[PDB]
């Protein structure tokens, strides 16, 4: 086969290490440790990682390398009745890009905003603050931090949106950042993985540089140890609570991202007899390693806020963009050489997102190249049209009420969509295709069959591991709300369409492939359950 292949082996490694390590390593794993019994949280985290995630992480990386094709084709050549999986997985990757790149633009607008000596978000006597302001985070909502009013009232101007319907003015300073993002994408992966494979060196290694700097300045700070205590001081009571084994199980899933079509796409250019098993374990480790490390960077600074700046930690130990955009920038502002910690930090946050946004694009570009060769013969040109659809719709997220539109996509674009999709991937591979077939495939590739441990995690554990999350994840349904803004019933119904528009293509192309073929039913499933390689 004249397929392409990674210019170097590190280009595949750093392309995967970068897709996996993003802001959720910096902002949701330290919170989960802090909230759920400290270091003791590492137990259910590691258990849910050992039996549920890395099993799944391994399974996809091996498939992608072996079946050598992108996400759509690789499920047609494996179980044709379930070719719809590849279609679902790809537009989910299409939907996410409608908001994921915005979070990078926020970083870039803060990076551009950190070119000064008095960082704007530190003082509360500016044109955008309110009389109900505090210089640092508190626990009353009418009174927000000076670094949180700079975010909601100047950077986002969310105070000028009465809801989802009131998008209000397009803010072009943010639009110009969203373009700088999609341009940073295009010229880094238009010509192929010949160049994307190299681009990821800066964007995947630079965070580790900024981490080591911020890990030193964080740890060499008055009150730095007090943070490390709140991070890891073990309370094994939380072990008992099953609400913690869901938070471990759900964080392991989205932090590694198996069954997303990316690792499959990235492996499809791997050389056949490459030891993917080694790559799976080495890659997965550097992931959870970076999150454990990153909690030290965050919570060293987070302890310094409590001891020096006089805040209750439960008021600064937050998750999500509030931490990287309000809380941590607020403590940077108090440190000497603050303009330096600002720039590396936001240039960290940006690079943390780019590698991961690269993977989403490629899973779409590769799945389409490997099926509609008009796309393949016209790569450079195709991507232009793709990223422009992103930018144009993305202008809806650069308005004043932009956040409300993002929050909807954060919840529905790829929420319950992907969880069922991967459940059908585990079922399609461990059961319909066959671990019998699958292990025989791997042995031909790397030289040995997967240990009976892996086979068992693939066939039973992972399906009930995914089931564990979707069940305990539907039990906690609440209508979409931000602050007091209750999203209207038609906005959820809309978000249900984009959540359905993925999963529906599983029984759709199951039905369409059934009806489009000749024979009798057991002759029907047999013809649609025997793979191409067979």
């Amino acid at each position, epitope marked *: 086969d004249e397929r392409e292949t990674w210019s170097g082996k590190v280009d595949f490694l750093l392309s995967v290490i970068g897709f996996a390590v993003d802001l959720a390593n910096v902002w949701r794993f330290p919170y989960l440790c802090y909230k759920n019994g400290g270091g003791a949280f590492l137990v259910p985290y590691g258990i849910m990682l050992a039996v549920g995630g890395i099993p799944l992480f391994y399974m996809e990386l091996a498939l992608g390398q072996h079946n050598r094709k992108g996400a759509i084709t690789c499920w047609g050549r494996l179980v044709p009745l379930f070719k719809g999986i590849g279609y679902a997985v790809v537009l989910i990757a299409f939907y996410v890009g409608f908001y994921y790149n915005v979070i990078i633009a926020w970083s870039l607008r803060f990076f551009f905003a950190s070119f000064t000596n008095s960082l704007p978000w530190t003082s509360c006597n500016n044109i955008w603050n309110t009389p109900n302001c505090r210089p640092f985070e508190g626990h009353v909502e009418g009174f927000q931090s000076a670094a949180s009013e700079y975010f909601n009232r100047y950077i986002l101007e969310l105070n000028r949106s009465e809801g989802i319907h009131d998008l209000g003015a397009i803010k072009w300073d943010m639009a110009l950042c969203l373009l700088i993002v999609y341009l940073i994408c295009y010229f880094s992966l238009w010509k192929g993985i010949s160049t994307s494979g190299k681009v990821v060196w800066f964007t995947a290694l630079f965070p580790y540089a900024v981490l080591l700097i911020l890990l030193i300045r964080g740890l060499t700070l008055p009150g730095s140890f007090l943070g490390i205590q709140y991070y890891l001081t073990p309370n094994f009571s939380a072990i008992y609570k099953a609400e913690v084994w869901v938070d471990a199980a759900t964080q392991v899933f989205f932090s590694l991202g198996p069954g997303f079509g990316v690792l499959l796409a990235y492996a499809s250019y791997n050389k056949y007899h490459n030891n993917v098993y080694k790559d799976a374990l080495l890659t997965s480790f550097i992931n959870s390693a970076t999150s454990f490390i990153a909690g030290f960077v965050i919570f060293s600074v987070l302890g310094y806020m409590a001891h020096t700046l006089g805040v209750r930690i439960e008021d600064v130990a937050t998750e999500g963009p509030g931490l990287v955009f309000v809380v941590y920038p607020a403590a940077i502002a108090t440190m000497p050489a603050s303009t330096f910690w600002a720039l590396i930090f936001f240039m960290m946050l940006a690079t943390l997102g780019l590698d991961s946004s690269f993977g989403g694009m490629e899973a779409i570009i590769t799945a389409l190249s490997d099926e509609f060769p008009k796309i393949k013969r016209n790569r450079e040109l195709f991507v232009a049209g793709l990223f422009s659809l992103y930018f144009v719709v993305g202008l809806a997220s650069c308005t004043q009420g932009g956040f409300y539109f993002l929050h909807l996509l954060d919840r529905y674009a790829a929420g319950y969509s992907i969880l069922v999709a991967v459940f059908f991937e585990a079922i399609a591979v461990s059961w319909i295709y066959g671990t*019998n*077939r699958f292990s*025989e495939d791997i*042995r*031909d590739m790397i*030289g*040995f*069959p997967p240990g009976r441990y892996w086979q068992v995690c693939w066939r039973f554990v992972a399906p009930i591991f995914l089931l564990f999350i979707t069940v305990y994840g539907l039990i906690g349904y609440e209508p979409l709300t931000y602050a007091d803004y209750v999203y209207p019933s038609w906005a959820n119904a809309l978000g249900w369409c984009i959540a359905g528009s993925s999963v529906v293509m599983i029984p759709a192309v199951a039905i369409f492939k059934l009806l489009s073929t000749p024979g009798s039913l057991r002759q029907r499933f047999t013809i649609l359950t025997t793979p191409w390689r*067979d």
Partner: antibody
Framework: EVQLVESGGGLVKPGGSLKLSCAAS????????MSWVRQSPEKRLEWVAE????????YYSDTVTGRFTISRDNARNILHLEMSSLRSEDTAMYYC????????????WGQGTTLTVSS | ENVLTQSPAIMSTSPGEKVTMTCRAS???????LHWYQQKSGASPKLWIY???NLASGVPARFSGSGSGTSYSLTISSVEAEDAATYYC?????????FGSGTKLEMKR
């Protein structure tokens, strides 16, 4: 324990066609790739064919390719080898060697069966 | 094809002595794939050393194995006469799989 038994084979006229059989017992024959290794009367070992466990990956030596066929009956636990256009340099004792892990080699070897090709 | 040659061809040794045999590949071979088989006069071969150094179950600890790249060796510390055999190396990295010429260890008297 694990044990393999090669069977069939004897005298064959050149150009003829003989089929050998290796009866596995003492382990899950379905889980292990087998391979056929032959040894000439000059005591030099030579690999012939390999078949994956499910039988969907089959590698031939460049010598025997197109002439031999290594099939595999995971029902009855029998490994096969179908020979056609038999030449005289095919004369050897044929071994049925169990190897699944390349990094471990051929775990177990059968007694062997003797092919003599001579007009 | 990856041609393997072993030396010496024949080797007479007094029991208790130390013997070394070498296996040299025409193409390079990854260390994890070169194995060693012991075959007694008129018996089926037996897997002896797998992946350069690891002895197989039943192989006395008097046997060692080393090497890398294009040159590997099998070394017997102190031989007894129950080790008179012919020893073959084998590579499992690429197809066709190839066996070496073998060394015939004979007892000296």
């Amino acid at each position: 324990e694990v044990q393999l038994v090669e069977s069939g084979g004897g005298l064959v006229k050149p150009g003829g066609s003989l089929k050998l059989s290796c009866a596995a017992s003492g382990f899950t024959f379905s889980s292990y790739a087998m391979s056929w290794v032959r040894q000439s009367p000059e005591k030099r070992l030579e690999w012939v064919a390999e078949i994956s466990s499910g039988g969907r990956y089959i590698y031939y030596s460049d010598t025997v390719t197109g002439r031999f066929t290594i099939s595999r009956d995971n029902a009855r636990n029998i490994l096969h080898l179908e020979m056609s256009s038999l030449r005289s340099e095919d004369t050897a004792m044929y071994y049925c060697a169990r190897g699944e892990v390349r990094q471990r080699g051929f775990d177990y070897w059968g007694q062997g069966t003797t092919l003599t090709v001579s007009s | 094809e990856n041609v393997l040659t072993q030396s010496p061809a024949i080797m007479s040794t007094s029991p208790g002595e130390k013997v070394t045999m070498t296996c040299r590949a025409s193409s390079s071979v990854g260390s994890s794939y070169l194995h060693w088989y012991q075959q007694k006069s008129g018996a089926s071969p037996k897997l002896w050393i797998y992946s350069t150094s690891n002895l197989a179950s039943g192989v006395p600890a008097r046997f060692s194995g080393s090497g890398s790249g294009t040159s590997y060796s099998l070394t017997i510390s102190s031989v007894e006469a129950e080790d008179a055999a012919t020893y073959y190396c084998q590579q499992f990295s690429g197809y066709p799989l190839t066996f070496g010429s073998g060394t015939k260890l004979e007892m000296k008297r």
